[PDB]
Amino acid sequence: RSYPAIPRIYAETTLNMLLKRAKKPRVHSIDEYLKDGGYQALEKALNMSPEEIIDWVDKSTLRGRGGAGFPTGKKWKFAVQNPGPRYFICNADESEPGTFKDRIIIERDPHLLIEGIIISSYAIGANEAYIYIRGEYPAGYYILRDAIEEAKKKGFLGKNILGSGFDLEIYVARGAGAYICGEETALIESLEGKRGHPRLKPPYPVQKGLWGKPTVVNNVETIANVPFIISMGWEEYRYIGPSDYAGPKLFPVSGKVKKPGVYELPMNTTLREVIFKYAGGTLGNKKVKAVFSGALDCFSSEELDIPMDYSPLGFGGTGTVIVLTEEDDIVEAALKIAEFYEHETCGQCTPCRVGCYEQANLLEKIYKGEATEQDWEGFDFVNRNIQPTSICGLGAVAGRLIRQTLEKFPEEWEKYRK
Amino acid sequence: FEFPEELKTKLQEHINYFPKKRQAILLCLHEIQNYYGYIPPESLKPLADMLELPLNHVEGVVAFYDMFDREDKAKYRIRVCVSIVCHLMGTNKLLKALENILGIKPGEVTPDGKFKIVPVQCLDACSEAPVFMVNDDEYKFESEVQLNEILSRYT
Ligand SMILES: NC(=O)C1=CN([C@@H]2O[C@H](COP(=O)(O)OP(=O)(O)OC[C@H]3O[C@@H](n4cnc5c(N)ncnc54)[C@H](O)[C@@H]3O)[C@@H](O)[C@H]2O)C=CC1
Ligand SMILES: Cc1cc2nc3c(=O)[nH]c(=O)nc-3n(C[C@H](O)[C@H](O)[C@H](O)COP(=O)(O)O)c2cc1C
Ligand code: SF4
Ligand code: FES
Ligand code: NA
Ligand code: NA
């Protein structure tokens, strides 16, 4: 059928795995997927025990592609130590600034995700799975609904899948404008028909999630890896990139680069190589001033030689690379980040609620040169005090990137103080 | 207040889709906004009954989720990203071109009720900045001439 218009995001791969089809900016339906050996991994998995599938995913070193980098096999193991029923959730809320890696899987190769969801659901003994896709991805929603019907038609979903005795239905829920609904416990609250208010953790969803039952939440890109682990085996999967941070990774690159788009690269790729080797360097060959890792971290021009892996000295996060060049005002950019957090705090926690608002309100006065001495000292104080009592990662990091700009670009901030 | 049957049928479908009726609330509110060009306050009492939820639950959900609008009927929502990357790559040029063509600013509706500009956070098509949506359709802004063509397709 006809889907809503989607910008044709550039996609390029050195590995030809996650982007084997998704490098072409169009829907790949089940026949094209089946032509490339699609759903043969699912058939292989259904002839293995759930325990064996968990072991392979564990041994693969697969880590959470949603941005926290939690070991995927280890998450699954925690779930299956708890009595059922269990639920599997695909987090497709993708709302971090500069982060458009998941949407090109959903919109272009939806069967890669669906095959991933079926194998993972089988592995953890979940007979009911959910995709929660953000409201502002309507095309992704219709593409997934149609893809799931294709899968049903071919007997990859429903009861007794391929004579295995494994039953699965995948339900597609839509968000309605909240960044916070991507936080796994807020997502679960939204799936239950409520406001997206994060839950105090522990318990983690794997212990108490959807209707209080053991629940695995995994990112789109994480799940998309599962068919490759089963198809190749974990040993071969681990040959891709460095053996400690193995597998393909999607790097969404935007801002002041010549070739903005998504790059499928191994995680031993450096930040400098992503910008200059793959994304074609900077617009007008201007010097890199900073890289925003979404709204999470700010890297200076002195930090471009870091691996794009989940190591302590690594880039980590979503792999999101927003490039600022020498003429981009860091305080203006900091203001845009403050405005984001102001708009998205759910308000449950007092220092998050007032701090996200005050950080944005004071930084705007600073940017416009209307800040009193009190507002300056106020801004510094609130930036340092959004985190206390926070029950989710939003409050924990709402000041992080802006603090990093204060420490890495003090001369620019001082201009705004005088 | 009663839902027209063609709308009620869709709402019932969504309510029958998930294992529990209350899981359908966001899809139902999307469906209501799609039909009326906003959420009419009067629609929430009948929806609560179909969802078997208290009204105050349903009203709290509509208030929480930024896509739902109870204030302004608009046939077409021009969602304009005002986040970091689109701001760097020319959100202001896009807003200027929208005012030149339609005569309105963020938050405002055209006098015919056809177009409302909705400032939104990152739509995550940042490589194609600056980004906007017209209802479900999503585009890179190139120039006023290109924007005029795109808007010409919404009648
Ligand atoms: N992709 C996107 O669009 C967005 C991504 N993010 C990312 O979200 C990240 C923060 O996420 P969180 O879920 O708060 O991180 P986290 O590190 O607290 O948790 C990561 C995952 O591991 C699980 N986990 C952690 N400790 C566990 C334990 N002891 N037992 C069992 N399971 C455990 C959690 O349940 C979760 O599924 C950031 O790094 C950011 O990059 C944030 C917003 C949007
Ligand atoms: C405020 C907030 C928003 C989040 N949004 C998303 C999101 O859109 N997508 C996502 O996959 N993870 C998101 N996360 C991370 C999830 O809580 C969770 O770590 C992840 O979905 C688990 O999958 P993974 O282990 O495969 O990375 C968010 C976290 C926070 C604190
Ligand atoms: S830290 Fe902020 S976003 Fe997270 S639950 Fe508390 S108030 Fe809500
Ligand atoms: S910053 Fe506008 S789409 Fe991401
Ligand atoms: Na096709
Ligand atoms: Na084996």
GROMACS .gro file of C-alpha atoms in nm, chain B residues 91-101 144:
model
   12
  509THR     CA    1   1.470   2.603   1.173
  510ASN     CA    2   1.443   2.989   1.153
  511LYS     CA    3   1.453   2.983   0.766
  512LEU     CA    4   1.168   2.722   0.772
  513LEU     CA    5   0.952   2.929   1.019
  514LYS     CA    6   1.014   3.248   0.807
  515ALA     CA    7   0.906   3.061   0.485
  516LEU     CA    8   0.591   2.928   0.667
  517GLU     CA    9   0.492   3.284   0.777
  518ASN     CA   10   0.557   3.419   0.419
  519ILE     CA   11   0.326   3.144   0.269
  562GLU     CA   12   1.030   2.862   0.037
   0.00000   0.00000   0.00000
